[PDB]
Ligand binder design. Sequence first.
Ligand SMILES: Nc1ncnc2c1ncn2[C@@H]1O[C@H](COP(=O)(O)O)[C@@H](O)[C@H]1O
Length: 321
Amino acid sequence: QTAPEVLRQWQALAEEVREHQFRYYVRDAPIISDAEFDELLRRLEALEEQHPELRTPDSPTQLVGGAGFATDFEPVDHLERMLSLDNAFTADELAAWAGRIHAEVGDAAHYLCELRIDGVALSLVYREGRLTRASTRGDGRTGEDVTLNARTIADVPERLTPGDDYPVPEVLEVRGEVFFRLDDFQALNASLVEEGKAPFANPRNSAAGSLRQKDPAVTARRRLRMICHGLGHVEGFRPATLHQAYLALRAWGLPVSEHTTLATDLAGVRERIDYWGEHRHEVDHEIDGVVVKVDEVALQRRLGSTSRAPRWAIAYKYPPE
Ligand SMILES: Nc1ncnc2c1ncn2[C@@H]1O[C@H](COP(=O)(O)O)[C@@H](O)[C@H]1O
C-alpha cells in the first residue's frame, strides 16, 4: 500500500493493458477475451482512482482510450553498426574475395551460404526475451523507429521462447529482411486498385511501403513476412559460430531460412552458386543472390569490418537477365 508496490502494480498493469489495446485496435488479433480485457482495465482504473499521481496524458486510462498508436520514424540508434555488403558478379571476384580469406587467416574457415532475399532490412532489439525496438537500416549507425509497425509481422514473435539448450539472452539484437511473397504481392496490388490506390511496381517497394506506415494498423492488414539473417549486439549469448546461432534463433521462435547450407571450402560454395543460379526462380520470394559468410565468429573478429562493409562476407549477385 506504498509507493514501491504502487508503482510496480500500475506499470505491470499498464503494459499488460496497453498491449491488449494494441493487440485489439492494431493487429485485429487479441489473445484474451473481451470479458477478461475489461477486468484488467477496471483494475488499472481502480488503482488510478486510489492514486491520482499516476493519472497522466500518456496513460491508457486518462488520455488515450484506443489512440496513441502512431509511428513517427524518429531517429533511433543501433546497438552495433549495421553495415551493408560488398558484392561479387563474377567467379573471378568470388575467387578473389576468397583469396584474401586463406591468403590470411588460413583453412579453419568454413563458409556458410545463404540465399539473398532482396527485401527491406529490419533490425529488432530484443530485451530480456521481450521485443522493445524495431528499426530500419538508415545510414548504418541510426535508423527509423518502426516499433509499432514491426510488432505486427506474423513472423516476428513479441516474446522469445525460453529453452534449456539455448537460454534466452538478456539483450538480443537480430537483423533480418522483411519481404512479400510473390502471390501476396499481387493480391495486395489488386486490393489497392480496388480502392483506387496506386499499385506497387515490385515486391521490395511494396515491402517497404507497407512497413513504413504512420498508422500501424495499415501494416497489420498486409501479409508482410520476415527472415532473420544476422546478429548485431548480444548480451548473454556468445555463439561459437553463425550456423549454431541459427539453432538458437529457432529455439527462441525467430524465423530462419531453410535454404542455408554449410560449405567447407570454395568448391562447396561454387556448387551452391551454380545450383542457385538455376533454382532461384523456384523460391516463393525474390532471391537475387547468395551471401557467403566466413562462418566462425572468432574468424569474423580477426577479419576486418571496414567502413560501411564487412570483410568476412561477400554477396554473389546473379545477373538479372
Ligand atoms: N544472408 C542474407 N540474406 C539476404 N539478405 C541479406 C543477407 N545479409 C544481408 N542481407 C541484406 O542485403 C543487404 C546488403 O546489400 P546492400 O544493402 O545493397 O549493400 C543488407 O544490408 C541486408 O539488408
